[PDB]
Design a protein around this ligand. Structure first.
Ligand SMILES: Nc1ncnc2c1ncn2[C@@H]1O[C@H](COP(=O)(O)OP(=O)(O)OP(O)(O)=S)[C@@H](O)[C@H]1O
Ligand SMILES: Nc1ncnc2c1ncn2[C@@H]1O[C@H](COP(=O)(O)OP(=O)(O)OP(O)(O)=S)[C@@H](O)[C@H]1O
Lengths: 44, 538, 148, 325, 325
């Protein structure tokens, strides 16, 4: 299945929520890695 | 004369590795014959692999090439014995077995000399384990010749290789392959490669072996039901299924528990490595590699054996309730729908519960080992953390139940909508002949809003589930590490402690979700088997 | 399912970036293995889809058959045709089981091979971490994240 | 549908339920020597290196065991003089095995065990050398690359010659080397039911190759269309022209046997023609042409075919019409 | 009673009073090289060790005789330098014989007798090496393990095909390798008395193999029942169905000849069927079956047989009834 079906599916949502979802996911994963990255320096 | 005995041990591996290469290159340049002790032989060969890895670790710790060459030679010797037994299973011979037996005897002699010269004065345990494994393989070879015609009188009275899984075209050969591929599914390489090119179909697919059909499972189930009813119900049918499906299920369950143990074991060797470097680690790394691969292999074999037992059970009880459909009376519309739901949802519930049966036995030992292990790494504070994660498991169940309720409501609305559609898509010409179509579309949209309203709560519960899923891992570490100081000693937390706790937190979060679905599946299966008993006995 | 796919893909990318940042050398060793997974992907889907649909098909005439026996039960018990119909139902349940069995076999195949590679990567990561981050690197806080 | 023997000449019938009890012997060597030249060279060097390393290991072991490997001056003479490490031991092994005999390291008359190891080393080396020479010579007798180049036309035709229906099919050579006393065994298979209620799944019957006064053989220089005429006595005489194209299952095989010149071995070529392969009422294009001073054969027109206005009818009905005309 | 040739193919007739005067020659080697691989390896190492020990003994003797074996410094040079005991003598013998040439012990230009013993040692060694190489290569041409695997059904049947009595008997292949131009020589033996008062103890007569227009040969891919029809001209046409089972002495032998592919040698298989072995009025079970996409042959039903309601009568009386019906 091409990217066109998903493109139409997400464009029915609009530009309002697409970025609000994608950047929030990116930031959540960045926090989930950064907590352990800081714990690494916490250890010693 | 230590190096003398080392060379004396190196010799026989060289002998076997040199005799094998002509025959291996002849074989490298469709009937599977299995011998008694084949599975035992492969198990012992894998144990030999492990002990040889340990010997290589010892030789690294000691260093002197001639003092650790025996391990590296026995490694290739065991691999070549595997290749030899593969070449014998693919084509039987009375002479290659003798060629293996001679090598086994010589290696036993050399190991005995090593043991004696050591007793006259870590090495001790590895040498003893190797001696025991070689002796058991020798006994397997002696059993083979006692059963075969290697040196026995004129003719062997061979087995006439089994036509159960080797006769006229069959494609799913699970029970008839090398016990290594029975684990790693190597026989699927050919199928999947051919499948890439040519589209699969029932003509391109195999036919089920005699080990698993409608007739075989029906026969075993009816034999158990007969032996239980001659001694005369829900409990009766239950115990009948239990005694009928027997060994396979418990075998899967014990595979599963051993895998769970090794999985709880991994993070501890991680911890040990982290300790050693901050203040004997390469050995721990290779042991971690071995333990990971073995644990996951056993987990997968467990899954498959359980799934196959479940498929057997589904076929069996399906053909059984069809056999019952022949003798029922006409006095008993609603019963037809109940019968076809008894096959479409009740049987699937039964079979998926039989999928999840070994998980229900392996979950408690997993959480118990997890909590006791984390306690000894983090102390009293660990206990507090060990509560929080566990507290997610009942809550999850509650959430799930809410979902179900919501689902029911939504389904109702959905059904009604379909009705209001079936008219419009039939009176098409009538509808468009006067353009009353928008008037009905307004009503259809009116139903849709109610449907949308239900979906909001359902998706809210889904969101709460996904949220807890990744929130409890964070909350455990938060309230544990911040509370480590608060709870008691507040001693320096070495990196090993924190990272081992992290690993164990994930290794415990993964199984926790499954307990909720397991409980739901079990109660639903109990209800469905009560229903099946009420039906099957009318 | 969309939420789960997004979480999974981002967690995987994050883990790869972590094990790369922890050891510079280990990164260069992990790109080969990952390319292996590409070849494991194609051969899987082009079959996993196929078997899937086959399952659906063997589920459809089976259930329907059941219903046909229930309504015209008197006619079938009258003709004494019970044997042939039981033969047909054994045939149908075999055709269902072979499909639902090959599907689980293929899932096990993909699982085991992807897992073997996921163990190769941790082996190589630990083997590089014990030497690079201790002997010369002399860093303790790195190997923890990478191994975990 | 299923074919009897494939076009390439290989057999299609797969055998099931063979006793297989007798095939439990050691025919190891010949089958290895039949392999491809690269694989055969690989296994030959493999055998040689295996034996060399085995005896080098045992010689290093015996020199270590006697104590002669322990470097010491006096109170002994090494069983093999001037031996120091595993490298010199392997050098001694390759010096005594392949019979070069450098003699820098000398085996002495002090240790009879070295005498025994030498006396077994030499005989095993001679035996393996003899087998590895005989086998490669038996291999260099491979003329199979030049054989099996014989070609038949992909589809065979039928025509009307001398007022009778006839079968036309092209054969031919592909090299300068001739084939001596090539004979044709032309056969037809069919699932037949006897009048006694017996049904055979496949029935081979000889359809003759029509040559001069007699003879089962032919002479192959140029592509010669094999010429047979089906008569009322022939087994193929009963079929119909419109039912052969799609439904019927008739395999007409030809077996051309003959001994090649240079090697003297008797090879053969077997090929099948199905019911859907054979066609009706056509004629091949003349290949041979009077060139400048010779006969030129054009193989581009080998499988080419031209339409011929010939009547289309069954051979039984054709014979009845011949009785009427 | 006595059989003509056994089932396994070997001959049963024992020859008596052979002149045996010519068989007094030395054909020694070839018969030894035909032996089993273990026995042949045993005799080869035996010959080699025999020659080696013989020449070692003669060299120790000559070194003892010259006085060079007596340990002494000066006033002489040993014919073979650095020779001390019988062990070093045997080492020198194996060093010069198998052509390794260590050169620690050197034969000198002082004694021409050592030159002569060396010049005979080398030539006899080369001759024995040449024969022991040629013979083992001639042995490795053994493809007899793959031959003689052809199988016939244990008992042959008779049936009624096309209104005439017929003989049905199964043959077949057991390996992938074909057999080229296999011909059938079907013969029958019987103690016959001519009308001139002459009594022959055994009388071979050719009973034809009924194929197409002609041909004495067949084509073997699948088990093909050989199909012969006894007519008034056939020699077997006179017997009775009730007298064959117990009393009569009739041996029907078949001789299937043919050249194997890989070796090119012409092998054959001979088998007998007695009067008590053959039975009446039956039919074989169809072996070939339309498998998934090929033809499956089941060898379990190879010797299986089903009853057929066919009339039981003598072939002469059957021909008389055919004249009446
Ligand atoms: N008992 C026997 N065994 C083997 N060969 C024989 C025997 N008798 C004769 N032969 C040979 O076969 C041929 C048969 O001829 P015979 O029957 O012996 O007549 P003949 O007049 O006796 O000839 P002779 O014995 O040579 S004077 C002779 O030429 C012999 O060489
Ligand atoms: N399945 C088989 N595959 C290959 N060879 C066979 C098979 N069965 C029999 N043979 C051999 O071919 C001959 C055929 O005779 P059969 O049909 O087996 O009659 P028979 O009375 O069963 O003879 P047996 O099996 O030797 S007691 C036998 O002599 C066997 O040696």
């Amino acid at each position: 299945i091409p990217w066109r079906a998903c493109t139409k599916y997400l464009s029915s949502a609009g530009i309002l929520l697409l970025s609000l979802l994608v950047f929030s996911q990116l930031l959540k994963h960045m926090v989930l890695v950064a907590i352990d990255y800081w714990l690494a320096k916490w250890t010693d | 004369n230590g190096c003398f005995v080392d060379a004396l041990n190196v010799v026989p591996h060289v002998f076997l590795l040199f005799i094998t290469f002509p025959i291996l290159f002849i074989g490298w340049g469709s009937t599977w014959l299995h011998f008694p002790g084949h599975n035992l032989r492969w198990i012992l060969t894998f144990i030999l692999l492990f002990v040889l890895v340990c010997e290589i670790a010892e030789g690294i710790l000691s260093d002197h090439l001639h003092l650790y060459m025996p391990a590296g030679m026995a490694f290739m010797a065991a691999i070549t014995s595997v290749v030899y037994y593969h070449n014998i299973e693919t084509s039987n011979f009375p002479k290659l077995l003798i060629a293996l037996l001679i090598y086994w005897t010589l290696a036993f002699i050399t190991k005995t000399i090593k043991f004696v010269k050591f007793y006259d004065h870590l090495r001790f345990c590895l040498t003893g384990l190797l001696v025991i494994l070689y002796g058991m393989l020798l006994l397997v070879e002696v059993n083979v010749i006692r059963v075969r015609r290697y040196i026995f009188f004129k003719t062997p009275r061979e087995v006439k290789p089994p036509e159960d899984l080797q006769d006229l075209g069959v494609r799913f050969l699970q029970p008839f392959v090398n016990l290594l591929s029975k684990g790693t599914y190597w026989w699927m390489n050919a199928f999947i490669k051919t499948a890439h090119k040519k589209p699969i179909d029932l003509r391109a697919i195999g036919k089920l072996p005699i080990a698993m059909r409608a007739l075989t499972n029906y026969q075993r189930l009816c034999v158990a039901f007969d032996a239980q009813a001659r001694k005369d119900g829900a409990r009766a049918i239950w115990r009948a299924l239990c005694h009928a499906f027997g060994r396979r299920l418990i075998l899967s369950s014990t595979f599963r528990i051993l895998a769970d143990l090794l999985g709880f074991a991994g993070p501890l060797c991680i911890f040990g490595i982290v300790d050693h470097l901050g203040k004997n680690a390469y050995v721990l790394a290779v042991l971690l590699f071995l333990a990971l691969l073995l644990q996951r292999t056993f987990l997968q074999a467990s899954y498959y054996v359980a799934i196959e037992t479940g498929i057997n059970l589904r076929g069996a009880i399906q053909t059984k309730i069809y056999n019952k459909i022949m003798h029922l009376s006409t006095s008993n519309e609603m019963t037809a729908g109940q019968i076809c739901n008894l096959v479409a949802i009740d049987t699937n519930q039964l079979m998926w519960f039989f999928f999840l049966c070994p998980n229900l036995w392996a979950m408690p030992v997993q959480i118990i080992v997890g909590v006791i292990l984390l306690y000894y790494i983090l102390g009293v504070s660990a206990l507090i953390g060990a509560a929080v994660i566990i507290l997610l498991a009942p809550v999850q169940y509650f959430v799930a139940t809410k979902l179900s309720q919501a689902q029911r409501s939504t389904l109702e609305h959905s059904n009604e909508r379909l009705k209001q559609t079936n008219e419009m898509l039939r009176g098409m010409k009538l509808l468009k002949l006067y353009a009353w179509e928008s008037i009905f579309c307004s009503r259809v949209e009116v139903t849709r809003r109610k449907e949308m309203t239900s979906l909001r709560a359902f998706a809210v519960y889904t969101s709460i589930s996904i949220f807890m899923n990744t929130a409890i891992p964070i909350a455990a570490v938060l309230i544990t590490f911040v509370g480590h100081v608060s709870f008691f000693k507040e001693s320096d937390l070495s990196p090993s402690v924190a990272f081992a706790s992290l690993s164990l937190f994930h290794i415990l979060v993964t199984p926790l979700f499954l307990l909720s679905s397991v409980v739901r599946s079990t109660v639903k299966a109990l209800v469905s088997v009560q229903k099946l008993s009420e039906f099957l006995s009318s | 399912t969309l939420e789960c796919l997004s979480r999974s893909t981002l967690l995987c990318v994050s883990a790869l970036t972590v094990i790369s940042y922890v050891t510079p050398v280990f990164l260069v060793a992990l790109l080969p293995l990952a390319v292996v997974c590409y070849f494991i992907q194609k051969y899987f889907r082009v079959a996993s889809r196929d078997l899937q649909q086959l399952d659906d098909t063997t589920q459809l005439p089976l259930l329907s058959h059941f219903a046909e026996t229930v309504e015209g039960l008197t006619t079938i018990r009258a003709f004494r045709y019970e044997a042939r119909f039981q033969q047909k139902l054994l045939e149908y349940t075999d055709s269902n089981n072979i499909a639902s069995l090959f599907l689980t076999a293929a899932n096990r195949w993909l699982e085991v091979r992807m897992e073997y590679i996921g163990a190769c990567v941790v082996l190589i990561a630990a083997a590089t971490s014990i030497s690079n981050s201790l002997h010369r690197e002399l860093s303790a806080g790195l190997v923890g994240l990478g191994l975990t | 549908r299923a074919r009897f023997v494939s076009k390439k000449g290989n057999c299609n019938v797969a055998h099931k339920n063979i006793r297989e009890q007798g095939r439990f012997l050691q025919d190891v060597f010949t089958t290895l020597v039949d392999l491809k030249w690269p694989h055969t060279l690989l296994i030959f060097t493999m055998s040689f290196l295996c034996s060399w390393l085995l005896f080098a290991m045992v010689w290093w072991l015996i020199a270590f065991a006697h104590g002669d490997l322990a470097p010491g001056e006096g109170t002994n003479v090494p069983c093999v003089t001037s031996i120091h490490s595993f490298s010199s031991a392997f050098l001694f092994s390759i010096e005594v095995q392949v019979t070069i005999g450098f003699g820098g390291r000398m085996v002495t008359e002090e240790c009879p065990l070295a005498i025994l190891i030498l006396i077994v080393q030499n005989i095993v080396g001679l035996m393996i050398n003899a087998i590895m020479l005989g086998c490669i010579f038996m291999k260099t007798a491979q003329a199979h690359r030049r054989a099996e180049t014989l070609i038949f036309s992909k589809h065979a035709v039928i025509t009307l010659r001398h007022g009778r229906l006839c079968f036309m099919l092209r054969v031919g050579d592909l090299r300068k080397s001739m084939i001596i006393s090539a004979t044709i065994h032309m056969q037809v298979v069919r699932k037949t039911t006897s009048p006694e209620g017996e049904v055979v799944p496949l029935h081979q019957v000889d359809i003759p190759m029509e040559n001069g006064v007699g003879g089962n053989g032919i002479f192959l220089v140029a592509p010669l269309i094999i010429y047979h005429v089906i008569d009322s006595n022939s087994p193929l005489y009963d079929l119909a022209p419109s039912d052969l194209h799609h439904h019927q299952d008739l395999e007409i095989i030809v077996i051309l046997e003959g001994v090649v010149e240079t090697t003297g071995i008797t090879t053969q070529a077997r090929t099948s023609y199905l019911a859907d392969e054979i066609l009706w009422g056509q004629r091949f294009v003349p290949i041979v042409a009077e060139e400048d001073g010779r006969y030129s054969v054009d193989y581009s027109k080998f499988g080419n075919t031209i339409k011929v206005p010939t009547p289309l009818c069954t051979a039984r009905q054709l014979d009845e019409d011949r009785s009427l005309l």
